[PDB]
Design a protein around this nucleic acid. Structure first.
Ligand SMILES: [Mn+2]
Ligand SMILES: [Mn+2]
Length: 257
DNA sequence: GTAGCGAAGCTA
């Protein structure tokens, strides 16, 4: 049995109490975090060490930042993407935990299809695909998860017409998501729930979470051996309902052997 | 238009 959760916390300093409650109540075996918004030396290591968790992270000031938090020691820690060696943005960290290769991603948002950040998103996803492909040659059990900033299909967008060829939802971005699936990865939530709206992000503005209008952009992609053991996938909207919340909801997958 | 950072604007 193994339980893994991914959560885009949007500032770990603000959300640390809620991270700690996730780790105390029905804890996962592994928790991965995105958008830490704290530098490498500002990570709350001692507070999570006190509770019995190992932590590896890659941080920077103000933006981005990723961490992996586990009961087991995370081994063979890799930082960033080999095909993009000079990118200073801290968006990828990988480790092997209990025989499972975990690749935690805070994928580029892109801002808008005509933004320069959209070309960056394109290049970055190209580099991610090459890295994942190489990692998959060595690890039969592999999980690629985090904030992809891509809603894969119309059922992952509350208003397909208004988001037509817009950021997160464009046919170009969806092809990049498909490029990752084509390596042999399964969209774990859609294996357990082929139908229905399972949004993971709701805009802070316009009370979108109360309206329950959001996108499914946080995913857990699994290798075949992990899909064969997949038991359930759930979006934790209760964490999203808390006071001063992250705009993303945690997503957890459970496997059995 | 909100949220977080960091101190005005950028990013999401
Ligand atoms: Mn459409
Ligand atoms: Mn944000």
């Amino acid at each position: 049995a193994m339980k893994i959760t991914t959560w885009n916390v949007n500032s770990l300093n603000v959300r640390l109490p809620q991270v700690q409650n996730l780790l105390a109540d029905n804890p996962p075996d592994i928790l991965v975090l995105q958008e830490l918004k704290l530098d490498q030396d500002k990570f709350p290591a001692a507070a999570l060490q006190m509770m019995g968790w190992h932590c590896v992270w890659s941080g920077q000031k103000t933006y981005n930042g990723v961490a992996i938090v586990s009961r087991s020691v995370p081994q063979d820690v890799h930082f960033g993407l080999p095909a993009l060696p000079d990118d200073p943005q801290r968006r990828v960290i990988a480790a092997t935990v209990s025989g499972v290769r975990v690749i935690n991603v805070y994928c580029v948002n892109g801002e808008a299809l005509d933004s320069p950040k959209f070309k960056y998103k394109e290049q970055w996803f190209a580099a991610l695909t090459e890295f994942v492909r190489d990692e998959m040659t060595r690890h039969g059990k592999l999980v690629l998860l985090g904030n992809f900033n891509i809603a894969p299909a119309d059922a992952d967008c509350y208003d397909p017409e208004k988001w037509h060829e817009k950021i997160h939802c464009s046919s170009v971005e969806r092809q990049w998501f498909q490029n990752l699936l084509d390596l042999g990865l399964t969209d774990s939530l859609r294996q357990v729930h082929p139908e229905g709206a399972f949004y993971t992000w709701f805009d802070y503005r316009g009370a979108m979470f109360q309206r329950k209008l959001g996108l499914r952009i946080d995913h857990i992609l699994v290798s075949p051996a992990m899909a064969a053991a997949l038991k359930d996938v759930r979006v934790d909207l209760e964490t999203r309902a808390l006071e001063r919340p992250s705009d993303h909801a945690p997503v957890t997958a459970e496997f059995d052997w």
